[model samples]
Target: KEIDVSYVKIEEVIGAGEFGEVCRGRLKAPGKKESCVAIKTLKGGYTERQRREFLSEASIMGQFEHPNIIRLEGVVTNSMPVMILTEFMENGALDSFLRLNDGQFTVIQLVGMLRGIASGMRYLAEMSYVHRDLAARNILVNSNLVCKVSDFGLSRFLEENSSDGKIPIRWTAPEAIAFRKFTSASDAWSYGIVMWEVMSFGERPYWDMSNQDVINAIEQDYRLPPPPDCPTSLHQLMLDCWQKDRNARPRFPQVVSALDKMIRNPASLKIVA
Candidate 1:
């Protein structure tokens, strides 16, 4: 449904990208007081393609209804500048949030975050959706440390392998980088990188490795070593997600199960290296 721009008040600028600005805003519903929301607006003078892409994210998010997934409040496409409204996450992006509060969370707390993300992915998987970009930077965390998968700009319905040159090289799977064959398996691979990001407290995935160097290393079977102080069980799960053979990677449901197991058996969270 079209959202009246007048009822939306931008309060703070949260993020920006080549596409546009993401702002914290207040949305006043017909019968209720104002509620906080995240507003993504396509800058003025946007091309038709840009407008469609921006609105497409709203359409996609609108179809999903899960706690770990961002909820779509509405869209403003009937006016000059187009916008997509979603619930505001107080903690912001998972990556930056972890970096700011490094060492503040227990291993169990970290695992809980991953479990939430996996649950969200499992929902998307069951719904036949592939979140082409699944990384820490693409996730949002609320004030309570609840993580929700965000950034649906590259998401698509599941289908046979397809290629996209714009995939993030570091977090992407070998098959996806080489052939552009993106699937849920490829997303699993990306999730592994996200795990490293969280455990490392938002350390950059390849450190100083250039994109070309990363590609070369992966081709030779090089994978990220366990992050500093990462639990043995969690690191093992990361390796499982990074399996070269996409078919060998665990599905989101299995990923969720593995996390649940570790959470239930806290003793299994011992550091390996």
Candidate 2:
């Protein structure tokens, strides 16, 4: 749906990017109650190509329909500041949320969040979509602790393009980091990083290691150690996701099943030494 700029009242700057600021807004449409939305807009005069590229995420997210996926509200393409509006996540990014509430949630609660993310990824995998930038920072949470995958600007359909050099080295699988091989399996590797982030309460992966160092470490078959107090089973799943061979990595369905089992049998969560 096309939304008028007049209908959106910018509340606060939630985030900023190369395109422009992402603002929290209260959208008022005719005959409808006011609703909160996140508006992505361009600040200065931009090229037509820039506008198309900025709006491409909306086009991609518009086609997605899952409970664990962010919903696109509308777009203000004809206006002065082109805006892409999406549902405002009250709890913001998963990493930030986990950081703020560190040690506040139980293992089962954290596992529940991971399970939701895995389910979302499972849906995307089934749809043949590969989210190249699947990380804890890219996932958002609602007021009720519902986690949803967001930030699709780097996502693409399941066609491996081994030429894009802008891969996130730390989260990427070794094959993908070396050859731009983005697939659901590579996404699973990223998900492992996310699991580590969640289990560690949003600690940065590699802990100040340079990108080159991360690449070198992965090449040397080094993986992240289990987070303090993390369940052995969950850590084992993370190791499975980070298998050097992308084809050997567990798919999203398997990841989901693993999380489900842990959730079902909470007694299996013995703390790793």
> Taking the tens digit of each residue's C-alpha lDDT, what string does model 2 give over 1-273?
789878999989988866899899899999999999988988568987878888888998998999899999889988778889999999999998999999999999999999999999999999998898888999999988989999776534333443442567788888887676778999999999999999999999999999999999889988999999999999999999999988899999999999999988899996566
Misplaced by over 4 Å in model 1 are: 154-165
Tens-digit lDDT track of model 1 for 1-273: 788888899999988955888899899978988899999888787778768877888888999999999999999888857889999999999999999989999899999999999999999999888888788998999988899998786644333236432568898899988877878999999999999999999999999999989999988989999988899889989999999999999999999999999989998888568
Q: lDDT of each prediction vs. the true structure?
A: 0.89, 0.89
At residue 5, what lDDT does model 1 achieve? 88
Backbone clashes under 3 angstroms, per model: 2, 0
Task: Give lDDT: candidate 2, residue 78.
Answer: 82
What are the C-alpha RMSDs, in order, of all predicted structures? Answer: 2.9, 2.7
TM-score of each candidate structure, all chains considered together: 0.93, 0.93
